[PDB]
Design a protein around this ligand. Sequence first.
Ligand SMILES: CN(C)[C@@H](Cc1c[nH]cn1)C(=O)O
Ligand SMILES: [Cl-]
Ligand SMILES: [Fe+3]
Ligand code: NA
Length: 441
Amino acid sequence: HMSFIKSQLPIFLNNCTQDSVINYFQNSWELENILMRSIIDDETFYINPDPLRNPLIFYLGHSAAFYINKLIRVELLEKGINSDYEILFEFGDPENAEELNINWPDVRQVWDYRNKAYEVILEVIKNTTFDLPIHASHPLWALMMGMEHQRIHFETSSMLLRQLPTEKVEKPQGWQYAPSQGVPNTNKMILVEGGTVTLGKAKDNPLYGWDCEYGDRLVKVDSFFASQYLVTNGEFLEFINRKGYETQSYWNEKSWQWKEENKVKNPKFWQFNNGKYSYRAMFDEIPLPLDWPVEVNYYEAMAYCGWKGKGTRLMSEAEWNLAAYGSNYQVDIEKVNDYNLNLKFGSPSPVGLVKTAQSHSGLWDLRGNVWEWLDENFHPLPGFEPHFLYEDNSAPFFDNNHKMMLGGAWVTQGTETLKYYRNWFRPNFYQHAGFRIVTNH
Ligand SMILES: CN(C)[C@@H](Cc1c[nH]cn1)C(=O)O
Ligand SMILES: [Cl-]
Ligand SMILES: [Fe+3]
Ligand code: NA
Protein backbone atom coordinates (compact mmCIF):
# COMPACT_ATOMS: atom_id res chain seq x y z
CA HIS A 1 0.00 0.00 0.00
CA MET A 2 0.99 3.64 -0.44
CA SER A 3 4.21 4.00 1.59
CA PHE A 4 6.33 6.67 -0.11
CA ILE A 5 3.77 9.38 0.76
CA LYS A 6 3.39 9.20 4.55
CA SER A 7 0.99 11.12 6.80
CA GLN A 8 1.81 11.47 10.49
CA LEU A 9 -0.88 10.31 12.90
CA PRO A 10 -2.62 12.81 15.21
CA ILE A 11 -1.31 13.43 18.72
CA PHE A 12 -3.10 13.62 22.06
CA LEU A 13 -3.16 17.08 23.63
CA ASN A 14 -1.24 15.71 26.64
CA ASN A 15 1.62 14.68 24.31
CA CYS A 16 1.75 17.79 22.08
CA THR A 17 5.40 18.53 22.72
CA GLN A 18 7.18 21.19 20.68
CA ASP A 19 9.15 18.52 18.81
CA SER A 20 6.12 16.38 17.96
CA VAL A 21 4.03 19.39 16.92
CA ILE A 22 6.86 20.64 14.71
CA ASN A 23 6.86 17.25 12.99
CA TYR A 24 3.07 17.17 12.65
CA PHE A 25 3.04 20.75 11.33
CA GLN A 26 5.77 20.08 8.76
CA ASN A 27 3.98 16.91 7.61
CA SER A 28 0.66 18.75 7.28
CA TRP A 29 2.25 21.43 5.07
CA GLU A 30 4.47 19.19 2.95
CA LEU A 31 1.48 16.99 2.11
CA GLU A 32 -0.52 19.94 0.76
CA ASN A 33 2.56 21.13 -1.14
CA ILE A 34 2.76 17.73 -2.85
CA LEU A 35 -0.88 17.93 -3.93
CA MET A 36 -0.67 21.56 -5.08
CA ARG A 37 2.57 20.85 -6.97
CA SER A 38 0.69 18.25 -9.06
CA ILE A 39 -0.84 21.03 -11.18
CA ILE A 40 1.43 21.36 -14.21
CA ASP A 41 0.52 24.81 -15.58
CA ASP A 42 -0.02 27.87 -13.40
CA GLU A 43 -2.89 29.05 -15.61
CA THR A 44 -4.81 26.03 -14.31
CA PHE A 45 -4.97 27.60 -10.83
CA TYR A 46 -7.52 30.13 -12.16
CA ILE A 47 -9.91 27.39 -13.23
CA ASN A 48 -12.60 26.42 -10.72
CA PRO A 49 -12.91 22.70 -11.61
CA ASP A 50 -15.92 22.31 -9.29
CA PRO A 51 -18.63 24.79 -10.38
CA LEU A 52 -19.70 25.08 -6.72
CA ARG A 53 -16.25 26.04 -5.35
CA ASN A 54 -13.71 28.82 -5.84
CA PRO A 55 -10.73 28.78 -8.23
CA LEU A 56 -7.75 26.66 -7.25
CA ILE A 57 -5.64 29.77 -6.58
CA PHE A 58 -7.92 30.46 -3.61
CA TYR A 59 -7.15 27.05 -2.11
CA LEU A 60 -3.42 27.49 -2.69
CA GLY A 61 -3.39 30.36 -0.19
CA HIS A 62 -6.42 29.55 1.95
CA SER A 63 -4.74 27.12 4.35
CA ALA A 64 -1.79 29.45 4.98
CA ALA A 65 -4.03 32.48 5.58
CA PHE A 66 -6.14 30.46 8.02
CA TYR A 67 -3.08 29.75 10.18
CA ILE A 68 -2.08 33.43 10.31
CA ASN A 69 -5.57 34.75 11.08
CA LYS A 70 -6.21 32.34 13.96
CA LEU A 71 -2.74 32.92 15.42
CA ILE A 72 -3.30 36.69 15.24
CA ARG A 73 -6.63 36.22 17.03
CA VAL A 74 -4.95 34.54 20.02
CA GLU A 75 -2.15 37.12 19.88
CA LEU A 76 0.55 34.53 19.25
CA LEU A 77 1.34 36.76 16.24
CA GLU A 78 1.51 40.56 16.41
CA LYS A 79 1.06 41.02 12.64
CA GLY A 80 0.34 39.03 9.51
CA ILE A 81 2.22 38.80 6.23
CA ASN A 82 -0.26 40.35 3.77
CA SER A 83 -3.48 41.84 5.15
CA ASP A 84 -5.10 41.89 1.70
CA TYR A 85 -4.30 38.21 1.10
CA GLU A 86 -5.47 37.38 4.63
CA ILE A 87 -8.82 38.89 3.61
CA LEU A 88 -9.05 37.50 0.08
CA PHE A 89 -8.04 33.94 1.05
CA GLU A 90 -10.33 33.84 4.13
CA PHE A 91 -14.00 33.49 3.16
CA GLY A 92 -14.71 30.00 1.85
CA ASP A 93 -21.35 26.95 0.15
CA PRO A 94 -23.69 27.69 -2.76
CA GLU A 95 -26.61 25.59 -3.94
CA ASN A 96 -26.06 26.52 -7.61
CA ALA A 97 -23.15 27.42 -9.85
CA GLU A 98 -24.93 30.70 -10.66
CA GLU A 99 -24.81 31.87 -7.05
CA LEU A 100 -21.13 30.93 -6.84
CA ASN A 101 -20.29 32.59 -10.16
CA ILE A 102 -12.37 39.34 -7.71
CA ASN A 103 -8.87 40.01 -9.05
CA TRP A 104 -6.76 37.00 -8.05
CA PRO A 105 -3.00 37.31 -7.43
CA ASP A 106 -0.40 35.52 -9.50
CA VAL A 107 0.53 31.94 -8.65
CA ARG A 108 4.11 32.85 -7.75
CA GLN A 109 2.88 35.52 -5.32
CA VAL A 110 0.67 33.01 -3.50
CA TRP A 111 3.49 30.46 -3.28
CA ASP A 112 5.67 33.24 -1.86
CA TYR A 113 3.01 34.01 0.75
CA ARG A 114 2.83 30.31 1.64
CA ASN A 115 6.61 30.13 2.07
CA LYS A 116 6.71 33.22 4.28
CA ALA A 117 3.75 31.98 6.32
CA TYR A 118 5.41 28.59 6.88
CA GLU A 119 8.56 30.19 8.30
CA VAL A 120 6.55 32.59 10.47
CA ILE A 121 4.50 29.78 12.02
CA LEU A 122 7.60 27.62 12.53
CA GLU A 123 9.17 30.47 14.52
CA VAL A 124 6.03 30.77 16.66
CA ILE A 125 6.25 27.06 17.47
CA LYS A 126 9.98 27.20 18.23
CA ASN A 127 9.53 30.27 20.46
CA THR A 128 6.37 29.27 22.37
CA THR A 129 6.30 27.15 25.51
CA PHE A 130 4.27 23.97 24.99
CA ASP A 131 2.99 23.61 28.56
CA LEU A 132 1.20 20.26 28.53
CA PRO A 133 -1.67 19.55 28.22
CA ILE A 134 -2.94 21.83 25.46
CA HIS A 135 -6.65 22.64 25.68
CA ALA A 136 -9.47 24.66 24.16
CA SER A 137 -8.81 27.74 26.30
CA HIS A 138 -5.06 27.60 25.51
CA PRO A 139 -3.68 29.96 22.82
CA LEU A 140 -2.09 27.01 20.99
CA TRP A 141 -5.60 25.74 20.17
CA ALA A 142 -5.31 28.16 17.24
CA LEU A 143 -2.36 26.12 15.93
CA MET A 144 -4.16 22.80 16.41
CA MET A 145 -7.09 24.33 14.50
CA GLY A 146 -4.90 25.46 11.61
CA MET A 147 -3.17 22.10 11.19
CA GLU A 148 -6.47 20.20 11.16
CA HIS A 149 -7.90 22.83 8.80
CA GLN A 150 -5.00 22.35 6.39
CA ARG A 151 -5.50 18.58 6.37
CA ILE A 152 -9.23 18.97 5.73
CA HIS A 153 -8.38 21.09 2.68
CA PHE A 154 -5.93 18.49 1.41
CA GLU A 155 -9.08 16.37 1.05
CA THR A 156 -11.35 19.08 -0.38
CA SER A 157 -8.68 20.14 -2.88
CA SER A 158 -8.04 16.53 -3.93
CA MET A 159 -11.63 16.54 -5.20
CA LEU A 160 -10.91 19.69 -7.21
CA LEU A 161 -7.83 18.14 -8.84
CA ARG A 162 -9.82 14.99 -9.68
CA GLN A 163 -12.24 17.17 -11.66
CA LEU A 164 -9.39 18.57 -13.77
CA PRO A 165 -8.45 16.82 -17.04
CA THR A 166 -5.77 14.17 -16.55
CA GLU A 167 -3.44 16.07 -18.89
CA LYS A 168 -3.33 19.05 -16.50
CA VAL A 169 -2.11 17.12 -13.43
CA GLU A 170 0.97 15.01 -12.69
CA LYS A 171 0.84 12.08 -10.28
CA PRO A 172 3.31 12.59 -7.40
CA GLN A 173 6.08 10.06 -6.88
CA GLY A 174 4.81 7.27 -4.66
CA TRP A 175 1.10 7.82 -5.23
CA GLN A 176 -0.33 4.30 -5.33
CA TYR A 177 -3.91 3.27 -6.02
CA ALA A 178 -5.36 0.21 -4.34
CA PRO A 179 -5.70 -2.97 -6.42
CA SER A 180 -8.90 -4.39 -7.86
CA GLN A 181 -9.77 -8.07 -7.41
CA GLY A 182 -12.54 -7.80 -10.02
CA VAL A 183 -16.15 -8.68 -9.20
CA PRO A 184 -17.10 -8.03 -5.55
CA ASN A 185 -18.21 -10.61 -3.04
CA THR A 186 -21.89 -10.86 -2.16
CA ASN A 187 -23.06 -7.91 -0.05
CA LYS A 188 -25.07 -9.53 2.74
CA MET A 189 -27.32 -7.67 5.17
CA ILE A 190 -26.05 -7.89 8.77
CA LEU A 191 -28.20 -7.44 11.86
CA VAL A 192 -26.79 -4.73 14.15
CA GLU A 193 -28.09 -5.42 17.66
CA GLY A 194 -29.87 -2.48 19.23
CA GLY A 195 -28.32 -0.50 22.04
CA THR A 196 -27.83 2.91 23.60
CA VAL A 197 -25.02 5.20 22.43
CA THR A 198 -23.67 8.49 23.74
CA LEU A 199 -22.97 11.03 21.00
CA GLY A 200 -20.61 13.97 21.44
CA LYS A 201 -17.27 14.77 23.03
CA ALA A 202 -16.42 16.12 26.47
CA LYS A 203 -14.81 19.53 26.80
CA ASP A 204 -11.81 17.99 28.61
CA ASN A 205 -11.26 15.25 26.02
CA PRO A 206 -7.50 15.09 25.27
CA LEU A 207 -7.88 15.54 21.49
CA TYR A 208 -8.45 18.56 19.30
CA GLY A 209 -11.96 18.84 17.92
CA TRP A 210 -14.24 21.32 16.19
CA ASP A 211 -17.15 22.96 17.98
CA CYS A 212 -19.84 20.77 16.38
CA GLU A 213 -18.11 17.68 17.83
CA TYR A 214 -18.79 18.63 21.46
CA GLY A 215 -21.92 17.89 23.45
CA ASP A 216 -23.73 14.98 25.05
CA ARG A 217 -26.73 13.03 23.73
CA LEU A 218 -27.94 9.58 24.73
CA VAL A 219 -29.83 7.83 21.91
CA LYS A 220 -31.58 4.47 22.16
CA VAL A 221 -30.96 2.77 18.81
CA ASP A 222 -33.26 -0.08 17.80
CA SER A 223 -31.70 -3.05 16.03
CA PHE A 224 -31.38 -2.69 12.27
CA PHE A 225 -30.03 -4.48 9.21
CA ALA A 226 -27.10 -3.02 7.27
CA SER A 227 -25.07 -4.19 4.28
CA GLN A 228 -21.70 -5.58 5.35
CA TYR A 229 -19.99 -3.65 2.54
CA LEU A 230 -20.41 -0.19 1.12
CA VAL A 231 -22.32 -0.38 -2.16
CA THR A 232 -19.79 -1.29 -4.85
CA ASN A 233 -19.31 0.05 -8.36
CA GLY A 234 -20.52 -3.32 -9.64
CA GLU A 235 -23.70 -3.11 -7.57
CA PHE A 236 -24.39 0.42 -8.83
CA LEU A 237 -23.74 -0.70 -12.41
CA GLU A 238 -26.76 -3.00 -12.07
CA PHE A 239 -28.83 -0.02 -10.88
CA ILE A 240 -27.81 1.82 -14.06
CA ASN A 241 -28.50 -1.16 -16.33
CA ARG A 242 -31.96 -1.44 -14.75
CA LYS A 243 -32.72 2.16 -15.82
CA GLY A 244 -32.06 3.61 -12.38
CA TYR A 245 -31.35 7.12 -13.68
CA GLU A 246 -34.44 7.04 -15.95
CA THR A 247 -37.22 5.98 -13.52
CA GLN A 248 -38.78 8.86 -11.60
CA SER A 249 -40.28 6.45 -9.05
CA TYR A 250 -36.79 5.90 -7.59
CA TRP A 251 -36.12 9.65 -7.21
CA ASN A 252 -37.96 12.67 -5.85
CA GLU A 253 -38.82 15.96 -7.52
CA LYS A 254 -35.80 17.78 -6.08
CA SER A 255 -33.34 14.97 -6.86
CA TRP A 256 -34.76 14.43 -10.37
CA GLN A 257 -34.43 18.16 -11.11
CA TRP A 258 -30.75 18.03 -10.11
CA LYS A 259 -30.10 15.00 -12.33
CA GLU A 260 -31.88 16.46 -15.36
CA GLU A 261 -30.35 19.94 -15.05
CA ASN A 262 -26.90 18.31 -14.87
CA LYS A 263 -27.74 15.68 -17.54
CA VAL A 264 -26.49 12.91 -15.25
CA LYS A 265 -26.48 9.34 -16.58
CA ASN A 266 -23.90 7.77 -14.24
CA PRO A 267 -21.72 8.59 -11.23
CA LYS A 268 -19.57 11.68 -11.68
CA PHE A 269 -16.26 9.84 -12.10
CA TRP A 270 -17.47 7.21 -14.58
CA GLN A 271 -17.22 7.66 -18.35
CA PHE A 272 -18.72 5.36 -20.98
CA ASN A 273 -16.57 4.67 -24.04
CA ASN A 274 -16.16 1.63 -26.31
CA GLY A 275 -19.04 -0.19 -24.63
CA LYS A 276 -17.23 0.01 -21.29
CA TYR A 277 -17.10 2.34 -18.29
CA SER A 278 -13.81 4.00 -17.42
CA TYR A 279 -13.21 5.43 -13.94
CA ARG A 280 -11.28 8.55 -12.97
CA ALA A 281 -8.91 8.07 -10.05
CA MET A 282 -6.95 11.10 -8.81
CA PHE A 283 -4.59 11.28 -11.80
CA ASP A 284 -5.48 8.53 -14.30
CA GLU A 285 -8.50 7.00 -15.99
CA ILE A 286 -8.68 3.25 -15.40
CA PRO A 287 -11.07 0.35 -15.98
CA LEU A 288 -13.99 0.60 -13.58
CA PRO A 289 -12.91 -1.06 -10.28
CA LEU A 290 -15.98 -3.21 -9.72
CA ASP A 291 -15.14 -4.08 -6.10
CA TRP A 292 -14.45 -0.51 -4.96
CA PRO A 293 -17.17 1.44 -3.13
CA VAL A 294 -19.24 3.55 -5.52
CA GLU A 295 -18.77 7.30 -5.12
CA VAL A 296 -22.06 9.23 -5.31
CA ASN A 297 -23.90 12.16 -3.78
CA TYR A 298 -26.86 11.85 -1.42
CA TYR A 299 -29.45 12.09 -4.21
CA GLU A 300 -27.88 9.13 -6.02
CA ALA A 301 -27.58 7.05 -2.85
CA MET A 302 -31.29 7.58 -2.19
CA ALA A 303 -32.20 6.71 -5.79
CA TYR A 304 -30.38 3.39 -5.30
CA CYS A 305 -32.34 2.86 -2.09
CA GLY A 306 -35.52 3.59 -4.04
CA TRP A 307 -34.63 0.97 -6.64
CA LYS A 308 -33.96 -1.52 -3.84
CA GLY A 309 -37.36 -0.70 -2.34
CA LYS A 310 -38.62 -2.47 0.78
CA GLY A 311 -38.11 0.64 2.88
CA THR A 312 -34.39 0.63 2.07
CA ARG A 313 -32.74 3.68 3.62
CA LEU A 314 -29.53 5.16 5.02
CA MET A 315 -28.27 5.12 8.59
CA SER A 316 -28.67 7.85 11.18
CA GLU A 317 -25.67 9.30 12.99
CA ALA A 318 -26.58 7.24 16.06
CA GLU A 319 -26.96 4.08 13.97
CA TRP A 320 -23.50 4.53 12.45
CA ASN A 321 -21.96 5.17 15.88
CA LEU A 322 -23.53 2.01 17.31
CA ALA A 323 -22.29 -0.13 14.42
CA ALA A 324 -18.82 1.45 14.44
CA TYR A 325 -18.06 1.89 18.15
CA GLY A 326 -20.80 0.03 20.02
CA SER A 327 -22.46 0.98 23.28
CA ASN A 328 -19.26 1.34 25.32
CA TYR A 329 -14.50 4.57 24.87
CA GLN A 330 -10.77 5.33 24.82
CA VAL A 331 -9.55 6.27 21.34
CA ASP A 332 -6.37 4.46 20.23
CA ILE A 333 -4.81 6.54 17.46
CA GLU A 334 -2.76 3.58 16.22
CA LYS A 335 -6.02 1.89 15.19
CA VAL A 336 -6.15 4.31 12.25
CA ASN A 337 -3.59 1.97 10.65
CA ASP A 338 -6.29 -0.75 10.59
CA TYR A 339 -8.50 1.04 8.04
CA ASN A 340 -8.09 2.66 4.62
CA LEU A 341 -7.35 6.02 6.23
CA ASN A 342 -4.47 8.48 6.41
CA LEU A 343 -3.12 7.68 2.93
CA LYS A 344 -2.68 3.95 3.42
CA PHE A 345 -3.85 3.97 -0.21
CA GLY A 346 -4.10 6.84 -2.68
CA SER A 347 -7.54 5.63 -3.70
CA PRO A 348 -10.62 3.74 -2.50
CA SER A 349 -9.99 0.08 -1.75
CA PRO A 350 -11.90 -3.11 -2.58
CA VAL A 351 -14.48 -3.66 0.14
CA GLY A 352 -13.01 -6.12 2.62
CA LEU A 353 -9.44 -5.96 1.29
CA VAL A 354 -8.06 -4.41 4.49
CA LYS A 355 -8.63 -7.45 6.71
CA THR A 356 -8.27 -5.26 9.82
CA ALA A 357 -11.16 -2.99 8.77
CA GLN A 358 -14.16 -5.02 10.01
CA SER A 359 -15.87 -3.41 12.99
CA HIS A 360 -17.05 -5.62 15.84
CA SER A 361 -20.57 -5.23 14.44
CA GLY A 362 -19.40 -7.22 11.41
CA LEU A 363 -19.66 -4.27 9.02
CA TRP A 364 -16.65 -3.51 6.82
CA ASP A 365 -15.12 -0.08 6.17
CA LEU A 366 -17.42 1.80 8.52
CA ARG A 367 -14.16 3.67 9.15
CA GLY A 368 -12.09 4.51 6.08
CA ASN A 369 -12.22 3.72 2.37
CA VAL A 370 -14.78 6.44 1.62
CA TRP A 371 -16.97 8.71 3.71
CA GLU A 372 -20.49 7.31 3.97
CA TRP A 373 -23.64 9.39 3.67
CA LEU A 374 -26.20 9.34 6.49
CA ASP A 375 -29.87 10.33 6.51
CA GLU A 376 -29.17 12.95 9.17
CA ASN A 377 -29.57 16.70 8.82
CA PHE A 378 -26.49 18.39 10.28
CA HIS A 379 -27.52 19.61 13.73
CA PRO A 380 -26.03 20.59 17.11
CA LEU A 381 -25.66 18.20 20.03
CA PRO A 382 -26.84 19.31 23.51
CA GLY A 383 -24.01 21.42 24.92
CA PHE A 384 -22.80 22.84 21.60
CA GLU A 385 -20.93 26.14 21.83
CA PRO A 386 -19.17 28.07 19.03
CA HIS A 387 -15.47 28.71 19.62
CA PHE A 388 -14.35 32.33 19.65
CA LEU A 389 -11.66 31.54 17.07
CA TYR A 390 -14.22 30.43 14.45
CA GLU A 391 -17.81 31.19 15.43
CA ASP A 392 -19.18 30.50 11.92
CA ASN A 393 -17.64 27.02 11.60
CA SER A 394 -20.86 25.00 11.93
CA ALA A 395 -23.69 27.18 13.27
CA PRO A 396 -24.71 28.58 9.83
CA PHE A 397 -25.17 25.04 8.46
CA PHE A 398 -27.80 23.89 10.97
CA ASP A 399 -30.32 24.70 8.24
CA ASN A 400 -31.88 21.34 7.25
CA ASN A 401 -30.11 21.66 3.87
CA HIS A 402 -26.99 19.62 4.77
CA LYS A 403 -26.71 15.84 5.20
CA MET A 404 -23.99 14.26 7.32
CA MET A 405 -21.25 11.74 6.54
CA LEU A 406 -18.91 9.88 8.88
CA GLY A 407 -16.01 7.44 9.07
CA GLY A 408 -13.31 9.12 6.99
CA ALA A 409 -11.89 8.20 3.60
CA TRP A 410 -8.52 7.06 2.23
CA VAL A 411 -7.50 10.73 1.94
CA THR A 412 -8.64 11.70 5.45
CA GLN A 413 -5.95 12.62 7.98
CA GLY A 414 -5.51 14.02 11.48
CA THR A 415 -8.20 14.15 14.14
CA GLU A 416 -10.72 13.83 11.29
CA THR A 417 -9.80 10.12 11.22
CA LEU A 418 -11.11 9.60 14.77
CA LYS A 419 -14.43 9.03 16.52
CA TYR A 420 -15.63 12.55 17.27
CA TYR A 421 -15.32 14.30 13.89
CA ARG A 422 -18.71 15.17 12.36
CA ASN A 423 -18.88 15.90 8.62
CA TRP A 424 -21.61 17.44 6.48
CA PHE A 425 -22.35 18.49 2.90
CA ARG A 426 -25.20 19.67 0.71
CA PRO A 427 -26.86 16.55 -0.74
CA ASN A 428 -25.90 17.31 -4.37
CA PHE A 429 -22.18 17.75 -3.62
CA TYR A 430 -19.51 15.18 -4.45
CA GLN A 431 -16.81 14.01 -2.04
CA HIS A 432 -14.75 10.85 -1.59
CA ALA A 433 -18.02 9.43 -0.29
CA GLY A 434 -20.26 6.40 -0.79
CA PHE A 435 -22.92 4.64 1.22
CA ARG A 436 -24.29 1.39 2.59
CA ILE A 437 -27.96 0.41 2.64
CA VAL A 438 -30.15 -0.24 5.67
CA THR A 439 -33.48 -1.96 6.32
CA ASN A 440 -35.40 -2.04 9.59
CA HIS A 441 -36.57 -5.61 8.88
C1 LIG B 1 -16.64 20.10 7.09
N1 LIG B 1 -16.76 20.75 5.79
C2 LIG B 1 -18.16 20.79 5.38
C3 LIG B 1 -16.08 22.04 5.71
C4 LIG B 1 -14.65 22.00 6.28
C5 LIG B 1 -14.00 23.34 6.27
C6 LIG B 1 -13.08 23.86 5.41
N2 LIG B 1 -12.82 25.13 5.85
C7 LIG B 1 -13.56 25.33 6.94
N3 LIG B 1 -14.30 24.28 7.23
C8 LIG B 1 -16.05 22.61 4.28
O1 LIG B 1 -15.59 21.89 3.39
O2 LIG B 1 -16.50 23.75 4.11
CL1 LIG C 1 -10.14 4.36 18.41
FE1 LIG D 1 -11.49 26.63 4.94
NA1 NA E 1 -16.79 4.46 5.63
